[PDB]
Amino acid sequence: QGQFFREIENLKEYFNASSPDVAKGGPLFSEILKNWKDESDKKIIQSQIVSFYFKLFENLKDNQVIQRSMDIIKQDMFQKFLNGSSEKLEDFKKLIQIPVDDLQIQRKAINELIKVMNDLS
Amino acid sequence: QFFREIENLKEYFNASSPDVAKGGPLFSEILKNWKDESDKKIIQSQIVSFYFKLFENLKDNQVIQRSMDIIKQDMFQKFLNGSSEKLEDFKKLIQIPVDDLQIQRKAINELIKVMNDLS
């Protein structure tokens, strides 16, 4: 709560994210978060939002100034969204990192479509 | 028709090849891990967005274009309950780049709201 606020401020500082030039261009996630506030299937949307932050942080991994801020925020997302389950986290990380432009991966995906479709229905 | 369509896609990509076995399964293991998980939509969300992104990346193979359209439409009906508002939101989220500074600032600026929603 106090370590978490400090960290978000640290990131806002680094990016210069508390300035008015930011609101310029419409919301990113805030509107969608309202649309699904009370939806029983909101995890569908939260999953995309959380994966976005993981990917963002992953690719800002070498900025020493914000490294720990990202580690703290990530750990928190992990606890709240993935119930601190380390097996769930490994799965989540594997899925978000899959490329769509790799042929070997495209074949596997097509190859597993029957199983995917059954899980959805 | 989607079943016959998956087989069409499997035929095109020559999915029965032993090459495809290399490196293990992509989603099948994960699907098992979460079969009875009350929060499985977290994982299905990532699997469905992968297919949606893949189908856009394959829009150049004209012969399989209708198979992909049929499969995609079916995922839309079953996973997003055919809700067109949900589809617009989902599509918007899966297309967000992580290398655009303007978007990064927006995301950092909305982090408190995101974190509150994860409650």
PDB file of C-alpha atoms in Angstrom:
ATOM      1  CA  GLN A   1       0.000   0.000   0.000  1.00  0.00           C
ATOM      2  CA  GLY A   2       2.855   2.427   0.848  1.00  0.00           C
ATOM      3  CA  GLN A   3       5.546   0.518  -1.084  1.00  0.00           C
ATOM      4  CA  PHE A   4       3.074   0.251  -3.971  1.00  0.00           C
ATOM      5  CA  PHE A   5       2.179   3.936  -4.175  1.00  0.00           C
ATOM      6  CA  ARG A   6       5.893   4.850  -3.953  1.00  0.00           C
ATOM      7  CA  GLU A   7       6.583   2.531  -6.893  1.00  0.00           C
ATOM      8  CA  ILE A   8       3.867   3.846  -9.170  1.00  0.00           C
ATOM      9  CA  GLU A   9       5.159   7.373  -8.505  1.00  0.00           C
ATOM     10  CA  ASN A  10       8.685   6.219  -9.352  1.00  0.00           C
ATOM     11  CA  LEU A  11       7.365   4.924 -12.727  1.00  0.00           C
ATOM     12  CA  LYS A  12       5.236   8.087 -13.319  1.00  0.00           C
ATOM     13  CA  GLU A  13       8.371  10.144 -12.735  1.00  0.00           C
ATOM     14  CA  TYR A  14      10.551   8.099 -15.130  1.00  0.00           C
ATOM     15  CA  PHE A  15       8.040   8.262 -17.982  1.00  0.00           C
ATOM     16  CA  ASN A  16       6.703  11.779 -17.162  1.00  0.00           C
ATOM     17  CA  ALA A  17       3.203  10.256 -16.838  1.00  0.00           C
ATOM     18  CA  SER A  18       1.464  12.705 -14.482  1.00  0.00           C
ATOM     19  CA  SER A  19       1.537  15.569 -17.017  1.00  0.00           C
ATOM     20  CA  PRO A  20      -1.538  16.776 -18.986  1.00  0.00           C
ATOM     21  CA  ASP A  21       0.006  15.754 -22.321  1.00  0.00           C
ATOM     22  CA  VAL A  22      -0.900  12.179 -21.294  1.00  0.00           C
ATOM     23  CA  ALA A  23      -4.707  12.509 -21.229  1.00  0.00           C
ATOM     24  CA  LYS A  24      -4.235  13.634 -24.856  1.00  0.00           C
ATOM     25  CA  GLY A  25      -5.609  10.910 -27.107  1.00  0.00           C
ATOM     26  CA  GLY A  26      -8.230   9.102 -25.031  1.00  0.00           C
ATOM     27  CA  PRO A  27      -8.105   6.405 -22.334  1.00  0.00           C
ATOM     28  CA  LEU A  28      -6.132   3.228 -22.798  1.00  0.00           C
ATOM     29  CA  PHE A  29      -7.724   0.926 -20.272  1.00  0.00           C
ATOM     30  CA  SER A  30      -9.925   3.112 -18.018  1.00  0.00           C
ATOM     31  CA  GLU A  31     -12.961   3.124 -20.273  1.00  0.00           C
ATOM     32  CA  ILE A  32     -12.843  -0.663 -20.806  1.00  0.00           C
ATOM     33  CA  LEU A  33     -12.374  -1.206 -17.056  1.00  0.00           C
ATOM     34  CA  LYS A  34     -15.694   0.613 -16.448  1.00  0.00           C
ATOM     35  CA  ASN A  35     -17.514  -1.290 -19.213  1.00  0.00           C
ATOM     36  CA  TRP A  36     -16.599  -4.552 -17.444  1.00  0.00           C
ATOM     37  CA  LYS A  37     -16.614  -3.444 -13.796  1.00  0.00           C
ATOM     38  CA  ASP A  38     -19.486  -5.766 -12.882  1.00  0.00           C
ATOM     39  CA  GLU A  39     -19.148  -8.358 -15.679  1.00  0.00           C
ATOM     40  CA  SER A  40     -18.847 -11.920 -14.397  1.00  0.00           C
ATOM     41  CA  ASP A  41     -16.296 -12.589 -17.170  1.00  0.00           C
ATOM     42  CA  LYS A  42     -14.068  -9.503 -16.554  1.00  0.00           C
ATOM     43  CA  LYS A  43     -10.992 -11.740 -16.130  1.00  0.00           C
ATOM     44  CA  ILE A  44     -11.060 -12.011 -19.939  1.00  0.00           C
ATOM     45  CA  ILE A  45     -10.260  -8.293 -20.116  1.00  0.00           C
ATOM     46  CA  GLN A  46      -8.028  -8.210 -17.041  1.00  0.00           C
ATOM     47  CA  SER A  47      -5.937 -10.965 -18.613  1.00  0.00           C
ATOM     48  CA  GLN A  48      -5.159  -8.747 -21.629  1.00  0.00           C
ATOM     49  CA  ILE A  49      -4.426  -5.734 -19.444  1.00  0.00           C
ATOM     50  CA  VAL A  50      -2.136  -7.700 -17.131  1.00  0.00           C
ATOM     51  CA  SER A  51      -0.314  -9.320 -20.058  1.00  0.00           C
ATOM     52  CA  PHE A  52       0.259  -5.871 -21.520  1.00  0.00           C
ATOM     53  CA  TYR A  53       2.048  -4.698 -18.323  1.00  0.00           C
ATOM     54  CA  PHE A  54       4.098  -7.863 -18.154  1.00  0.00           C
ATOM     55  CA  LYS A  55       5.261  -7.422 -21.724  1.00  0.00           C
ATOM     56  CA  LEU A  56       5.929  -3.716 -21.160  1.00  0.00           C
ATOM     57  CA  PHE A  57       7.946  -4.356 -18.041  1.00  0.00           C
ATOM     58  CA  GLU A  58       9.812  -7.212 -19.689  1.00  0.00           C
ATOM     59  CA  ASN A  59      11.026  -4.912 -22.412  1.00  0.00           C
ATOM     60  CA  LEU A  60      12.015  -2.156 -19.977  1.00  0.00           C
ATOM     61  CA  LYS A  61      13.838  -4.777 -17.857  1.00  0.00           C
ATOM     62  CA  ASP A  62      17.250  -3.077 -18.206  1.00  0.00           C
ATOM     63  CA  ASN A  63      16.230   0.391 -16.991  1.00  0.00           C
ATOM     64  CA  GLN A  64      17.938   0.165 -13.614  1.00  0.00           C
ATOM     65  CA  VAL A  65      15.984   3.149 -12.299  1.00  0.00           C
ATOM     66  CA  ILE A  66      12.608   1.419 -12.544  1.00  0.00           C
ATOM     67  CA  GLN A  67      13.603  -2.227 -12.325  1.00  0.00           C
ATOM     68  CA  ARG A  68      12.529  -2.699  -8.709  1.00  0.00           C
ATOM     69  CA  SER A  69       9.314  -0.677  -9.264  1.00  0.00           C
ATOM     70  CA  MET A  70       8.356  -3.079 -12.029  1.00  0.00           C
ATOM     71  CA  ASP A  71       9.315  -6.095  -9.864  1.00  0.00           C
ATOM     72  CA  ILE A  72       7.090  -4.811  -7.038  1.00  0.00           C
ATOM     73  CA  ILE A  73       4.106  -3.972  -9.265  1.00  0.00           C
ATOM     74  CA  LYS A  74       4.458  -7.342 -11.058  1.00  0.00           C
ATOM     75  CA  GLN A  75       4.637  -9.310  -7.793  1.00  0.00           C
ATOM     76  CA  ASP A  76       1.467  -7.544  -6.687  1.00  0.00           C
ATOM     77  CA  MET A  77      -0.371  -8.327  -9.928  1.00  0.00           C
ATOM     78  CA  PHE A  78       0.745 -11.912  -9.446  1.00  0.00           C
ATOM     79  CA  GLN A  79      -0.690 -12.095  -5.933  1.00  0.00           C
ATOM     80  CA  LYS A  80      -4.022 -10.448  -6.739  1.00  0.00           C
ATOM     81  CA  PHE A  81      -4.702 -11.757 -10.244  1.00  0.00           C
ATOM     82  CA  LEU A  82      -2.998 -15.143 -10.264  1.00  0.00           C
ATOM     83  CA  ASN A  83      -3.570 -15.896  -6.513  1.00  0.00           C
ATOM     84  CA  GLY A  84       0.166 -16.123  -5.925  1.00  0.00           C
ATOM     85  CA  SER A  85       0.086 -19.452  -7.791  1.00  0.00           C
ATOM     86  CA  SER A  86       3.543 -19.946  -9.233  1.00  0.00           C
ATOM     87  CA  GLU A  87       2.361 -22.636 -11.694  1.00  0.00           C
ATOM     88  CA  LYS A  88      -0.302 -20.239 -12.995  1.00  0.00           C
ATOM     89  CA  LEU A  89       2.374 -17.585 -13.427  1.00  0.00           C
ATOM     90  CA  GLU A  90       4.666 -19.854 -15.445  1.00  0.00           C
ATOM     91  CA  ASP A  91       1.704 -20.678 -17.753  1.00  0.00           C
ATOM     92  CA  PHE A  92       0.673 -17.046 -18.077  1.00  0.00           C
ATOM     93  CA  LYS A  93       4.218 -15.959 -18.915  1.00  0.00           C
ATOM     94  CA  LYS A  94       4.584 -18.699 -21.471  1.00  0.00           C
ATOM     95  CA  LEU A  95       1.354 -17.776 -23.242  1.00  0.00           C
ATOM     96  CA  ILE A  96       1.985 -14.020 -23.450  1.00  0.00           C
ATOM     97  CA  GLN A  97       5.403 -14.555 -25.000  1.00  0.00           C
ATOM     98  CA  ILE A  98       4.291 -16.720 -27.940  1.00  0.00           C
ATOM     99  CA  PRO A  99       5.113 -15.211 -31.372  1.00  0.00           C
ATOM    100  CA  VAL A 100       2.451 -15.283 -34.107  1.00  0.00           C
ATOM    101  CA  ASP A 101       4.929 -15.034 -36.971  1.00  0.00           C
ATOM    102  CA  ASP A 102       6.833 -18.271 -36.362  1.00  0.00           C
ATOM    103  CA  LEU A 103       5.778 -21.065 -38.787  1.00  0.00           C
ATOM    104  CA  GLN A 104       6.625 -23.968 -36.480  1.00  0.00           C
ATOM    105  CA  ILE A 105       4.460 -22.300 -33.813  1.00  0.00           C
ATOM    106  CA  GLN A 106       1.620 -21.656 -36.317  1.00  0.00           C
ATOM    107  CA  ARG A 107       1.494 -25.372 -37.194  1.00  0.00           C
ATOM    108  CA  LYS A 108       1.349 -26.423 -33.558  1.00  0.00           C
ATOM    109  CA  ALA A 109      -1.455 -23.934 -32.941  1.00  0.00           C
ATOM    110  CA  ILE A 110      -3.474 -25.164 -35.901  1.00  0.00           C
ATOM    111  CA  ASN A 111      -2.684 -28.682 -34.829  1.00  0.00           C
ATOM    112  CA  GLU A 112      -4.151 -28.033 -31.372  1.00  0.00           C
ATOM    113  CA  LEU A 113      -7.264 -26.173 -32.449  1.00  0.00           C
ATOM    114  CA  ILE A 114      -9.600 -29.083 -31.784  1.00  0.00           C
ATOM    115  CA  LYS A 115      -8.463 -29.270 -28.175  1.00  0.00           C
ATOM    116  CA  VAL A 116      -8.714 -25.472 -27.812  1.00  0.00           C
ATOM    117  CA  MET A 117     -12.211 -25.334 -29.259  1.00  0.00           C
ATOM    118  CA  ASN A 118     -13.490 -28.125 -26.953  1.00  0.00           C
ATOM    119  CA  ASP A 119     -12.236 -26.233 -23.908  1.00  0.00           C
ATOM    120  CA  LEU A 120     -14.181 -23.177 -25.012  1.00  0.00           C
ATOM    121  CA  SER A 121     -17.369 -25.252 -25.487  1.00  0.00           C
TER     122      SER A 121
ATOM    123  CA  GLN B   1     -18.560 -26.608 -40.194  1.00  0.00           C
ATOM    124  CA  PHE B   2     -15.742 -25.480 -37.907  1.00  0.00           C
ATOM    125  CA  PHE B   3     -14.558 -29.065 -37.337  1.00  0.00           C
ATOM    126  CA  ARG B   4     -14.297 -29.650 -41.093  1.00  0.00           C
ATOM    127  CA  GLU B   5     -12.609 -26.239 -41.182  1.00  0.00           C
ATOM    128  CA  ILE B   6      -9.954 -27.162 -38.588  1.00  0.00           C
ATOM    129  CA  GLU B   7      -9.141 -30.238 -40.675  1.00  0.00           C
ATOM    130  CA  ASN B   8      -8.806 -27.917 -43.728  1.00  0.00           C
ATOM    131  CA  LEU B   9      -6.338 -25.774 -41.822  1.00  0.00           C
ATOM    132  CA  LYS B  10      -4.542 -28.902 -40.571  1.00  0.00           C
ATOM    133  CA  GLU B  11      -4.272 -30.084 -44.175  1.00  0.00           C
ATOM    134  CA  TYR B  12      -2.914 -26.773 -45.414  1.00  0.00           C
ATOM    135  CA  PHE B  13      -0.305 -26.504 -42.691  1.00  0.00           C
ATOM    136  CA  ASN B  14       0.462 -30.191 -42.903  1.00  0.00           C
ATOM    137  CA  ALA B  15      -0.209 -30.498 -39.166  1.00  0.00           C
ATOM    138  CA  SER B  16       0.332 -34.295 -39.056  1.00  0.00           C
ATOM    139  CA  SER B  17       4.101 -33.829 -39.668  1.00  0.00           C
ATOM    140  CA  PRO B  18       6.509 -35.181 -37.002  1.00  0.00           C
ATOM    141  CA  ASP B  19       8.258 -31.780 -37.213  1.00  0.00           C
ATOM    142  CA  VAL B  20       5.326 -30.246 -35.343  1.00  0.00           C
ATOM    143  CA  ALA B  21       6.140 -32.510 -32.386  1.00  0.00           C
ATOM    144  CA  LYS B  22       9.499 -30.794 -31.753  1.00  0.00           C
ATOM    145  CA  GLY B  23       9.533 -28.567 -28.671  1.00  0.00           C
ATOM    146  CA  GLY B  24       6.410 -30.027 -27.063  1.00  0.00           C
ATOM    147  CA  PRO B  25       2.736 -28.880 -27.116  1.00  0.00           C
ATOM    148  CA  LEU B  26       1.771 -25.239 -27.227  1.00  0.00           C
ATOM    149  CA  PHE B  27      -1.518 -25.046 -25.306  1.00  0.00           C
ATOM    150  CA  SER B  28      -2.691 -28.605 -24.569  1.00  0.00           C
ATOM    151  CA  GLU B  29      -0.718 -28.941 -21.329  1.00  0.00           C
ATOM    152  CA  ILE B  30      -1.834 -25.549 -20.040  1.00  0.00           C
ATOM    153  CA  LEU B  31      -5.470 -26.377 -20.969  1.00  0.00           C
ATOM    154  CA  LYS B  32      -5.227 -29.408 -18.687  1.00  0.00           C
ATOM    155  CA  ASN B  33      -3.660 -27.445 -15.804  1.00  0.00           C
ATOM    156  CA  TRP B  34      -6.662 -25.130 -15.851  1.00  0.00           C
ATOM    157  CA  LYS B  35      -9.524 -27.473 -16.916  1.00  0.00           C
ATOM    158  CA  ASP B  36     -11.396 -27.104 -13.615  1.00  0.00           C
ATOM    159  CA  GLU B  37     -10.001 -23.728 -12.522  1.00  0.00           C
ATOM    160  CA  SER B  38     -12.691 -21.142 -11.759  1.00  0.00           C
ATOM    161  CA  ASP B  39     -10.379 -18.509 -13.301  1.00  0.00           C
ATOM    162  CA  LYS B  40      -9.601 -20.397 -16.565  1.00  0.00           C
ATOM    163  CA  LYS B  41     -10.912 -17.415 -18.597  1.00  0.00           C
ATOM    164  CA  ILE B  42      -7.545 -15.781 -17.738  1.00  0.00           C
ATOM    165  CA  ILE B  43      -5.793 -18.442 -19.799  1.00  0.00           C
ATOM    166  CA  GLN B  44      -8.455 -18.837 -22.515  1.00  0.00           C
ATOM    167  CA  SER B  45      -8.206 -15.093 -23.025  1.00  0.00           C
ATOM    168  CA  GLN B  46      -4.504 -15.429 -23.965  1.00  0.00           C
ATOM    169  CA  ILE B  47      -5.139 -18.508 -26.172  1.00  0.00           C
ATOM    170  CA  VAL B  48      -8.048 -16.861 -28.029  1.00  0.00           C
ATOM    171  CA  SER B  49      -6.091 -13.608 -28.548  1.00  0.00           C
ATOM    172  CA  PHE B  50      -3.211 -15.657 -29.944  1.00  0.00           C
ATOM    173  CA  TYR B  51      -5.511 -17.219 -32.563  1.00  0.00           C
ATOM    174  CA  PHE B  52      -7.044 -13.859 -33.456  1.00  0.00           C
ATOM    175  CA  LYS B  53      -3.533 -12.391 -33.990  1.00  0.00           C
ATOM    176  CA  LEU B  54      -2.462 -15.487 -35.917  1.00  0.00           C
ATOM    177  CA  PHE B  55      -5.467 -15.320 -38.213  1.00  0.00           C
ATOM    178  CA  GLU B  56      -4.596 -11.690 -39.043  1.00  0.00           C
ATOM    179  CA  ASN B  57      -0.989 -12.726 -39.698  1.00  0.00           C
ATOM    180  CA  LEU B  58      -2.235 -15.434 -42.127  1.00  0.00           C
ATOM    181  CA  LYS B  59      -4.747 -13.234 -44.067  1.00  0.00           C
ATOM    182  CA  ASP B  60      -2.400 -13.682 -47.074  1.00  0.00           C
ATOM    183  CA  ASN B  61      -3.045 -17.417 -47.687  1.00  0.00           C
ATOM    184  CA  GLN B  62      -6.219 -16.978 -49.646  1.00  0.00           C
ATOM    185  CA  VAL B  63      -7.336 -20.608 -49.768  1.00  0.00           C
ATOM    186  CA  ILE B  64      -7.724 -20.942 -45.964  1.00  0.00           C
ATOM    187  CA  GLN B  65      -9.225 -17.487 -45.403  1.00  0.00           C
ATOM    188  CA  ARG B  66     -12.825 -18.785 -45.019  1.00  0.00           C
ATOM    189  CA  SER B  67     -11.765 -21.570 -42.595  1.00  0.00           C
ATOM    190  CA  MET B  68     -10.147 -18.940 -40.389  1.00  0.00           C
ATOM    191  CA  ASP B  69     -13.216 -16.720 -40.642  1.00  0.00           C
ATOM    192  CA  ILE B  70     -15.448 -19.595 -39.597  1.00  0.00           C
ATOM    193  CA  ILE B  71     -13.251 -20.640 -36.678  1.00  0.00           C
ATOM    194  CA  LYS B  72     -12.808 -17.067 -35.497  1.00  0.00           C
ATOM    195  CA  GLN B  73     -16.580 -16.408 -35.657  1.00  0.00           C
ATOM    196  CA  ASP B  74     -17.146 -19.504 -33.555  1.00  0.00           C
ATOM    197  CA  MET B  75     -14.571 -18.483 -30.910  1.00  0.00           C
ATOM    198  CA  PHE B  76     -16.331 -15.104 -30.819  1.00  0.00           C
ATOM    199  CA  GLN B  77     -19.719 -16.711 -30.172  1.00  0.00           C
ATOM    200  CA  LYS B  78     -18.493 -19.131 -27.505  1.00  0.00           C
ATOM    201  CA  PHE B  79     -15.847 -17.118 -25.677  1.00  0.00           C
ATOM    202  CA  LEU B  80     -17.283 -13.632 -25.894  1.00  0.00           C
ATOM    203  CA  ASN B  81     -20.949 -14.704 -25.891  1.00  0.00           C
ATOM    204  CA  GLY B  82     -21.443 -13.046 -29.284  1.00  0.00           C
ATOM    205  CA  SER B  83     -21.342  -9.675 -27.556  1.00  0.00           C
ATOM    206  CA  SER B  84     -20.122  -7.212 -30.143  1.00  0.00           C
ATOM    207  CA  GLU B  85     -19.172  -4.593 -27.539  1.00  0.00           C
ATOM    208  CA  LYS B  86     -16.972  -7.174 -25.813  1.00  0.00           C
ATOM    209  CA  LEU B  87     -15.415  -8.022 -29.142  1.00  0.00           C
ATOM    210  CA  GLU B  88     -14.485  -4.420 -29.892  1.00  0.00           C
ATOM    211  CA  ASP B  89     -12.828  -4.081 -26.412  1.00  0.00           C
ATOM    212  CA  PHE B  90     -10.993  -7.407 -26.727  1.00  0.00           C
ATOM    213  CA  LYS B  91      -9.698  -6.542 -30.188  1.00  0.00           C
ATOM    214  CA  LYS B  92      -8.553  -3.162 -28.996  1.00  0.00           C
ATOM    215  CA  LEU B  93      -6.616  -4.686 -26.081  1.00  0.00           C
ATOM    216  CA  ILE B  94      -4.838  -7.408 -28.024  1.00  0.00           C
ATOM    217  CA  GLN B  95      -3.530  -4.909 -30.641  1.00  0.00           C
ATOM    218  CA  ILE B  96      -1.782  -2.551 -28.174  1.00  0.00           C
ATOM    219  CA  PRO B  97       1.931  -2.089 -28.842  1.00  0.00           C
ATOM    220  CA  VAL B  98       4.394  -2.077 -25.914  1.00  0.00           C
ATOM    221  CA  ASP B  99       7.072  -0.098 -27.771  1.00  0.00           C
ATOM    222  CA  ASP B 100       5.158   3.198 -28.207  1.00  0.00           C
ATOM    223  CA  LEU B 101       6.197   5.855 -25.657  1.00  0.00           C
ATOM    224  CA  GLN B 102       2.850   7.665 -25.801  1.00  0.00           C
ATOM    225  CA  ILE B 103       1.018   4.473 -24.906  1.00  0.00           C
ATOM    226  CA  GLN B 104       3.499   3.574 -22.163  1.00  0.00           C
ATOM    227  CA  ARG B 105       2.851   6.908 -20.463  1.00  0.00           C
ATOM    228  CA  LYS B 106      -0.900   6.338 -20.668  1.00  0.00           C
ATOM    229  CA  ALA B 107      -0.554   2.841 -19.209  1.00  0.00           C
ATOM    230  CA  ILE B 108       1.633   4.114 -16.347  1.00  0.00           C
ATOM    231  CA  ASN B 109      -0.802   6.911 -15.835  1.00  0.00           C
ATOM    232  CA  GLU B 110      -3.655   4.358 -15.514  1.00  0.00           C
ATOM    233  CA  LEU B 111      -1.837   1.927 -13.286  1.00  0.00           C
ATOM    234  CA  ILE B 112      -3.668   2.962 -10.083  1.00  0.00           C
ATOM    235  CA  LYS B 113      -7.028   2.338 -11.745  1.00  0.00           C
ATOM    236  CA  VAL B 114      -5.828  -1.012 -13.161  1.00  0.00           C
ATOM    237  CA  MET B 115      -4.483  -2.135  -9.771  1.00  0.00           C
ATOM    238  CA  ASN B 116      -7.729  -1.129  -8.000  1.00  0.00           C
ATOM    239  CA  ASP B 117      -9.716  -3.260 -10.449  1.00  0.00           C
ATOM    240  CA  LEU B 118      -7.526  -6.300  -9.662  1.00  0.00           C
ATOM    241  CA  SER B 119      -8.633  -5.781  -5.975  1.00  0.00           C
TER     242      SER B 119
END
